[PDB]
Design an enzyme around this catalytic site. Structure first.
Site, PDB file in Angstrom:
ATOM      1  N   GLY B  17       0.671  -1.160   0.396  1.00  0.00           N
ATOM      2  CA  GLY B  17       0.186   0.150  -0.108  1.00  0.00           C
ATOM      3  C   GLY B  17       0.635   1.248  -0.143  1.00  0.00           C
ATOM      4  O   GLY B  17       2.241   1.356  -0.634  1.00  0.00           O
ATOM      5  N   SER B  18       0.145   2.382   0.865  1.00  0.00           N
ATOM      6  CA  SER B  18       0.816   3.995   0.505  1.00  0.00           C
ATOM      7  C   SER B  18       1.206   4.248   2.143  1.00  0.00           C
ATOM      8  O   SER B  18       0.020   4.289   2.547  1.00  0.00           O
ATOM      9  CB  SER B  18       0.356   4.356  -0.014  1.00  0.00           C
ATOM     10  OG  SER B  18      -0.235   4.320  -1.811  1.00  0.00           O
ATOM     11  N   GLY B  19       2.247   4.618   2.217  1.00  0.00           N
ATOM     12  CA  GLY B  19       2.622   5.247   3.335  1.00  0.00           C
ATOM     13  C   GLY B  19       2.729   6.068   3.988  1.00  0.00           C
ATOM     14  O   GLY B  19       2.556   6.708   2.973  1.00  0.00           O
ATOM     15  N   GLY B  22       6.228   7.848   0.609  1.00  0.00           N
ATOM     16  CA  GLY B  22       5.989   6.065  -0.711  1.00  0.00           C
ATOM     17  C   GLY B  22       4.839   5.909  -0.450  1.00  0.00           C
ATOM     18  O   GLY B  22       4.433   5.484  -0.330  1.00  0.00           O
ATOM     19  N   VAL B  24       4.675   1.607  -0.020  1.00  0.00           N
ATOM     20  CA  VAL B  24       5.005  -0.166   1.344  1.00  0.00           C
ATOM     21  C   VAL B  24       4.790  -1.232   0.372  1.00  0.00           C
ATOM     22  O   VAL B  24       3.888  -1.637   0.182  1.00  0.00           O
ATOM     23  CB  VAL B  24       4.352   0.574   2.663  1.00  0.00           C
ATOM     24  CG1 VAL B  24       4.686  -1.000   3.451  1.00  0.00           C
ATOM     25  CG2 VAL B  24       4.349   1.233   2.811  1.00  0.00           C
ATOM     26  N   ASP B 129      -1.212  11.258  16.801  1.00  0.00           N
ATOM     27  CA  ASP B 129      -1.782  10.531  15.320  1.00  0.00           C
ATOM     28  C   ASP B 129      -1.809   9.071  15.842  1.00  0.00           C
ATOM     29  O   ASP B 129      -1.663   8.255  15.418  1.00  0.00           O
ATOM     30  CB  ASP B 129      -1.422  10.897  13.615  1.00  0.00           C
TER      31      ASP B 129
HETATM   32  C1  LIG Z   1      -0.677  -1.551   6.292  1.00  0.00           C
HETATM   33  C2  LIG Z   1       0.456  -2.780   5.443  1.00  0.00           C
HETATM   34  N1  LIG Z   1       1.710  -3.375   6.289  1.00  0.00           N
HETATM   35  N2  LIG Z   1       2.702  -1.731   6.709  1.00  0.00           N
HETATM   36  C3  LIG Z   1       3.445  -2.481   6.750  1.00  0.00           C
HETATM   37  C4  LIG Z   1       4.763  -1.518   7.686  1.00  0.00           C
HETATM   38  C5  LIG Z   1       5.547  -0.623   7.678  1.00  0.00           C
HETATM   39  C6  LIG Z   1       6.327   0.473   7.926  1.00  0.00           C
HETATM   40  C7  LIG Z   1       7.282   0.632   7.656  1.00  0.00           C
HETATM   41  C8  LIG Z   1       7.822  -0.396   6.228  1.00  0.00           C
HETATM   42  C9  LIG Z   1       8.665   1.653   7.909  1.00  0.00           C
HETATM   43  C10 LIG Z   1       7.938   2.471   8.745  1.00  0.00           C
HETATM   44  C11 LIG Z   1       6.887   2.707   9.728  1.00  0.00           C
HETATM   45  C12 LIG Z   1       6.844   3.570  10.813  1.00  0.00           C
HETATM   46  N3  LIG Z   1       7.161   4.176  10.941  1.00  0.00           N
HETATM   47  C13 LIG Z   1       7.134   4.350  12.331  1.00  0.00           C
HETATM   48  C14 LIG Z   1       8.072   5.440  12.616  1.00  0.00           C
HETATM   49  C15 LIG Z   1       7.829   6.430  13.994  1.00  0.00           C
HETATM   50  C16 LIG Z   1       7.767   5.368  15.068  1.00  0.00           C
HETATM   51 CL1  LIG Z   1       7.798   5.283  16.536  1.00  0.00          CL
HETATM   52  C17 LIG Z   1       7.802   3.778  14.919  1.00  0.00           C
HETATM   53  C18 LIG Z   1       7.244   4.263  13.331  1.00  0.00           C
HETATM   54  N4  LIG Z   1       4.946   3.210  11.013  1.00  0.00           N
HETATM   55  C19 LIG Z   1       4.472   2.807  10.598  1.00  0.00           C
HETATM   56  C20 LIG Z   1       4.861   0.685   9.328  1.00  0.00           C
HETATM   57  C21 LIG Z   1       5.966   1.551   9.133  1.00  0.00           C
HETATM   58  C22 LIG Z   1       4.088  -3.574   7.515  1.00  0.00           C
HETATM   59  C23 LIG Z   1       4.193  -4.574   7.964  1.00  0.00           C
HETATM   60  N5  LIG Z   1       5.281  -4.230   9.177  1.00  0.00           N
HETATM   61  N6  LIG Z   1       3.863  -5.766   8.151  1.00  0.00           N
HETATM   62  C24 LIG Z   1       2.317  -6.072   7.749  1.00  0.00           C
HETATM   63  N7  LIG Z   1       1.350  -5.279   7.265  1.00  0.00           N
HETATM   64  C25 LIG Z   1       2.249  -4.054   7.142  1.00  0.00           C
END
Ligand SMILES: CCn1nc(C#Cc2c(C)ccc3c(Nc4ccc(Cl)cc4)nccc23)c2c(N)ncnc21
Ligand SMILES: CCn1nc(C#Cc2c(C)ccc3c(Nc4ccc(Cl)cc4)nccc23)c2c(N)ncnc21
Lengths: 253, 274
Positions: B17-19, B22, B24, B129
């Protein structure tokens, strides 16, 4: 990674869980449940301090699901290492100390997660000595966590008997595959402990592969036999091992 | 220049998907991982600075209830790698799947979220958030906190290009809603967001179901007349849970407890029902 020291007084130590590689291991409260490995001495020896520093420096480089999560350390009160709290038991307990009957898919998945962890460690130029089923913890009985927990001759390689290398770890992983697919320790029939050492180091003794289950995959057994090669430089590297195990597992999902 | 992953070691796979920035994907790197990369040839100063800020915040986290950062790559493109989690977000389980957990499971999810948030606050990290979309249920049993969604970006010409953080207006605190100055966010705003999460956990629905206009919610909550209806909590919801949720949803910023006290209350509550 920097500034990982936990100040004194932040951790609430609880029930003593046992004795680890060094010192004692307790369950603590620090933003949730944690495990604390402390050295209960007033002044640590040079050996103890160097082992602590080496282990901490190795732990601060690991961020993988199949490696026990290092979280911090303390030195002001005493040498301490903090890791995540895992619910479950070691693989040795599930196999040889309990009556848990796993599915073949579960065995394959455990082997795959262990291969992932070991390939990650080898990618970091980290040789994990003393690898065994006791050192593979089953978090919630579903996730593999690798660590140096606190007899290990069964997994020892011929060269180490006579110096540690990646190939000795591959051989230990082969022994782990053996106890996963057969369900028992390699040399139950041999009773003299000293005899096993000399015989295996000489090269006359090797695990009996007739103990594998009927439903054990062919490729899995062949890979296990290739990892248990008597020659050090005849065993495949962990990338190929992980690739074979993943290709096997991915056809059953 | 540490924690950098050399190019070619990761096998990028299906687009997930979209993070936050960029795209993901699910990748192969000593197992299953998640890669959030920026598909540009040359990154802008804003993009590179955001990447570096997120990486520097992620490199300080080592907690079970925080999404495990694993490394980053820059040679092909700016990318951040985290563990691969199996399951769905709490928002999906609650409002997109209507999965009915047991009360013990709701209490445990609140407890793990409190652990993660107290850990982040101990690192002087204000996680803005915080919502059920940003709380992932790894194997549907373990809480992983992360910034999955997008931020709100006002359209240069008219009213919103981005509005996912306006989707998080439901979790925004009154002080954050009112002035929107340079960082009105605080640890107490995160406490309020956690209170709204407790609300959707114990009631099962969003705070303002009947009200649909976003501007109405903004004006009412910022003014101070609007607050979630706590009569929607289930009968079997613990009394202490409802009281803590009400204390976390205090309109005044400095009338809400800190996350140490919140985690202590939740842990003491959970240990009396097992
Ligand atoms: C919806 C589908 N989806 N998306 C996944 C992902 C991912 C992320 C990546 C690759 C990099 C940075 C992220 C991030 N940064 C961050 C910044 C500050 C703090 Cl404190 C904590 C986190 N926040 C959230 C996610 C990511 C994912 C997975 N790992 N497993 C299964 N489905 C998944
Ligand atoms: C049943 C008893 N028991 N023992 C636990 C523990 C512990 C450890 C601590 C506290 C510190 C360091 C460790 C370590 N170092 C290490 C070095 C190199 C590498 Cl690569 C990886 C790891 N290896 C293994 C374990 C620990 C434990 C737990 N965490 N949860 C539940 N039961 C538990």
């Amino acid at each position: 990674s920097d500034d990982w020291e936990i100040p004194d007084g932040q951790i609430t130590v609880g029930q003593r869980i046992g004795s680890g590689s060094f010192g004692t291991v307790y369950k603590g409260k620090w933003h949730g449940d944690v495990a604390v490995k402390m050295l209960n001495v007033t002044a640590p020896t040079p050996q103890q301090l160097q082992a602590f520093k080496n282990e901490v420096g190795v732990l601060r480089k690991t961020r993988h699901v199949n490696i026990l999560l290092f979280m911090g350390y303390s030195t002001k009160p005493q040498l301490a290492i903090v890791t995540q709290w895992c619910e479950g038991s070691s693989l040795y307990h599930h196999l040889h100390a309990s009556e848990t009957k796993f599915e073949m898919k579960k065995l394959i998945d455990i082997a795959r997660q262990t291969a992932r962890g070991m390939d990650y460690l080898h990618a970091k130029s980290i040789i994990h000595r003393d690898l065994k089923s006791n050192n593979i913890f089953l978090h919630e009985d579903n996730t593999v966590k690798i660590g140096d927990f606190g007899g290990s001759i069964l997994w020892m390689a011929p060269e180490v008997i006579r110096p540690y290398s990646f190939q000795s770890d591959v051989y230990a992983f082969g022994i782990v595959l053996y106890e996963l697919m057969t369900g028992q320790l390699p040399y139950s029939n041999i009773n003299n402990r000293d005899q096993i050492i000399e015989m295996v180091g000489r090269g006359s003794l090797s695990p009996d592969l007739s103990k594998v289950r009927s439903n054990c995959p062919k490729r899995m057994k062949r890979l296990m036999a290739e990892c248990l090669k008597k020659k050090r430089d005849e065993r495949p590297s962990f990338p190929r091992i992980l690739a074979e195990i993943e290709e096997l597992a991915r056809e059953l999902s």
